[model samples]
Target: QVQLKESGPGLVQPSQTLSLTCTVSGFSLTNNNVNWVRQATGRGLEWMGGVWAGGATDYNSALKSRLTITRDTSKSQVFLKMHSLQSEDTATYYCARDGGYSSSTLYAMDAWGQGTTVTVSSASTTAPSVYPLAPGSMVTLGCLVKGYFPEPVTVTWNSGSLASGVHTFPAVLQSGLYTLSSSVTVPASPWASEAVTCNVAHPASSTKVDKKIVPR
Candidate 1:
């Protein structure tokens, strides 16, 4: 399994720019693409876009002009740069490897880095590790869940709700590892009973785990 870890600041002041690096040693950035994604604390996952194998970039239209994905083959690190950060940009940032074609066939995120979340709030110091989750709210799950790789990770409600999301590019690190993420939207009711789990499947075996939020 490809192992990845994210390193950077946990918080960013509002309006300031944000920069982060995804370090991997398993895969060559030149051989694949790198992607930047964000997950709001207990919210849905958003794709920031990706740098193709040749450094050509593609991003979600909403964040298109503001996001940039770059790589350093020498250091084996993928970097992300975004200008004019806002409270909305305050989320856990991740770098990952993707196995999709420029023309078509975008599947799932194969490898992923432990996300580093940056916030724009300055109203308080030292944020709590636990964030609030309202019933039926959408959320994104970061990283290859349950050690699944070369496959895809999916997000859905425990009651069998499904979501469709884009595959992210892999962030090549110094350790030759790749990383990726998956996300989904939640329903408004039944929050008290259903669990939202991100399941990643690997050929090695089929195992899954999950996190749930209950409505008060």
Candidate 2:
């Protein structure tokens, strides 16, 4: 039950500071050290810093002068405060649980926030692609809207009805692009009469891509 959700902001306030809050639940922060990590547009992963289980902190040499990690035990939350952002700092930052339990899980990073994209002097964005989740569930017609930019989008199920058990999570930042996941839980039984069409309408240009389920 290790879960951590990250809160991100829209648009970088050029030459300003940014605060990333890691909302951790299902696990106690007092017993685990949470790390703040980020990546450049490419594959450059930087181990920014972290607040340890013992209350100490560490930061990357490059960002030592401008970054700091703090936390509140009461809420089991971690905060990363950094300023003097630059356009070159455009990247996806993630909050990850440090180390691992037992063994072999070292630096796994298997469990991390989907990632928050931050762009400095960042004045750009694009549309997203609607992709269906592989056949799973009974089913929760889940769609993965990827390749978008640093912002929000409206993901809905069906055209006008069957909005029950519908959930659309916040967009996740990855490699400078953002992705969204919207899933609707439906009862396959004809008697239930629920639905999922996986319709994604692009924020601009009114792009609507409808994906239906193949009879199973």
Candidate 3:
């Protein structure tokens, strides 16, 4: 039932100070710690800081010089402050519940905030490459879409505009990019003469790229 919401400005100026708030509910700040982690668009997670339940705080050594974490136990809010903000400081911030510590190391986050964005950002678009994985004699065809960014891709099996027995997996994040796969099993008799096509609607490509798999 733990929940967190991050609040911050959409844009911030460089060489200036920036502040963000993480308001939590269903969890008590006095009993459970809240941690902050941020990730730049097209980048990986960067540990920002953490506010301990005991009121003490710790921050990543890289940002220790310019970062501070404070909280208000009464309001269940945690605040993050950064000095001399720069383009590199721009990232979407998420607040999480500490999963507890182990062998002097913290475990993974248990609860998390949706995230709040700060400017100093840009987009990186990468078109996906689609391929047919394997073809079965019973006619199960798999389409693979790999190396795309920003997710939300569309994959369709076009036999009569769309397929009937198709299964598309949710996109998986791999190394900051997205990968997905869709498969369709066709009746052996009909597929012996008809053709099936795999169409990938890549947002960055601006057009649907397709490959027709004919009787083979």
Candidate 4:
């Protein structure tokens, strides 16, 4: 696994803000999009969106309004900033890698961040609004397969099943024991659920590993 670890102040006082960093290695930005995911304490992990290798970005509708993602290419680090302070916002934030050229819709984040914890307190009564997931002007997706010795694998996407104004990208893989990921870009459509799936096939394994990403 391409390793990632999130670092930041563990405790944010009430009414204060939260900032975290996702440090990554064993991969390059040119290979994929970097996505940040967060989970409130006792809550499920939610896709916070990503920054693409091309400089474009994607955000979860629930987080777009309150979240900001930036990258320092020189350091190969990605930064996440979330405004407002509420107890409900307490969660562990992580940074993960999505394989692709563009930073758009992605599934199966191959690399993952170790995660940093953040807590909102009563002192911060004022909280930022939840970000509304917005459709982007363009849609892009990436697919990659890595790891497993001496075995050839293939990745495929089904775009015909996609909705209008949506686009999918062909996947690429590195030959070694590493994580594989895929990203998809498209306007939100009722058909999106049926359209996106990244599949990896290796003859040596019992079957292919298919990852499905549903961004709400």
Highest TM-score scorer: 2
Q: Give per-residue CA lDDT, model 2, range 89-186, as digits (tens).
A: 77888999865463257645656887887766543567787777745425556778888764657766677475778888977667667788987777
Give candidate 3's error at residue 111 in angstroms: 0.6
Ranking by TM-score: 2, 3, 1, 4
- Give TM-scores for every candidate, taking all chains together and pairing residue i with residue i: 0.53, 0.57, 0.54, 0.51
lDDT values, one for every candidate: 0.58, 0.76, 0.79, 0.62
Best by lDDT: 3
Error of 4 at 131 (Å): 44
Model 3 per-residue lDDT tens digits across residues 1-216: 779999986666678788899999987887677889999867799888898878988899999999999999998899998998887776788888874553123556788899987754233567888877665446787778887865567878883365678889988766656789988888787567777788888765575778776543
Candidate 1 stretches greater than 4 Å from native? 101-107, 124-216
* Segments of candidate 3 deviating more than 4 angstroms: 99-106, 121-216
Q: For model 2, what is the error of residue 180's alpha carbon versus the real structure, in angstroms, after optimal superposition?
A: 18
Q: Per-residue CA lDDT of candidate 1, range 72-110, in tens?
A: 888878888788888667677887777566423353677
Better of 2 and 4 by lDDT: 2
Ranking by lDDT: 3, 2, 4, 1
Pitting candidate 1 against candidate 3, the one with the higher lDDT is 3
Measure candidate 2: CA RMSD.
Answer: 9.8
Better of 3 and 4 by TM-score: 3
Clashing pairs in 3: none
